[PDB]
Design a protein around this ligand. Sequence first.
Ligand SMILES: C[C@]12CCC(=O)C[C@@H]1CC[C@@H]1[C@@H]2CC[C@]2(C)[C@@H](O)CC[C@@H]12
Lengths: 248, 10
Amino acid sequence: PIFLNVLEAIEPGVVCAGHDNNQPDSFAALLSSLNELGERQLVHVVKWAKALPGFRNLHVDDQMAVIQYSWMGLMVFAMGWRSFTNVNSRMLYFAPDLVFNEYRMHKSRMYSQCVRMRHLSQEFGWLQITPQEFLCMKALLLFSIIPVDGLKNQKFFDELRMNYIKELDRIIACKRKNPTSCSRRFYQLTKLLDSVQPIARELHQFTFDLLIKSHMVSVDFPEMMAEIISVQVPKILSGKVKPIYFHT
Amino acid sequence: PSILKKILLE
Ligand SMILES: C[C@]12CCC(=O)C[C@@H]1CC[C@@H]1[C@@H]2CC[C@]2(C)[C@@H](O)CC[C@@H]12
């Protein structure tokens, strides 16, 4: 199971948000920390992504594009996984030192988006997602959103995507006899991956609005963050870059 | 970008 050996071997480690719990919760403090966390996890993503099977085959420019357009959905997915394995999707485990309880969910002014994130978190349990399905599914997320015109080398991006889809397909097909369960498992998981997009765009909208008035609410933005939210996110929000859905 | 780009072509 070479492909799996690789995914498991290159999975990023535990990342701390550097949040000062001793401080009273406050919109600015919570968001400033999520943005710092966002900036840190972004580093691991780039290293994780580049060590992916057949990834460096993509034109160096499409490597930036895909990473830049899909980090939100990737980070939200993993985070939903950490939540599920730690605080059992009861709360939201963004980082070891930044766990969201109902109070903080309301305090950050994103309770609505958090409710949907926690739902996703529960899905891992309800659907009994295995550690292997999670990894193949999360790889797929990286290839799940592109510009409507196409990347530098679109022909090749689609190839890589096909292979990753075929992998998630084998992961299910292994340890499973006959064929309606497989066919059924594949339907549930592609539906799960789809449900990630709607949540992602909500956060894109939220963070963009946030950055614009950041200096009014005292919320800090790291440099790659403030950079990506105004140079790549705007094109997702304006319909230039679009998610690739499995189902209609 | 510029800081992102560097982490990649790295
Ligand atoms: C991706 C992060 C940070 C990494 C993670 O575990 C998921 C979480 C989802 C909400 C994001 C946050 C990064 C900073 C954002 C984008 C805030 O600006 C508003 C929404 C926040």
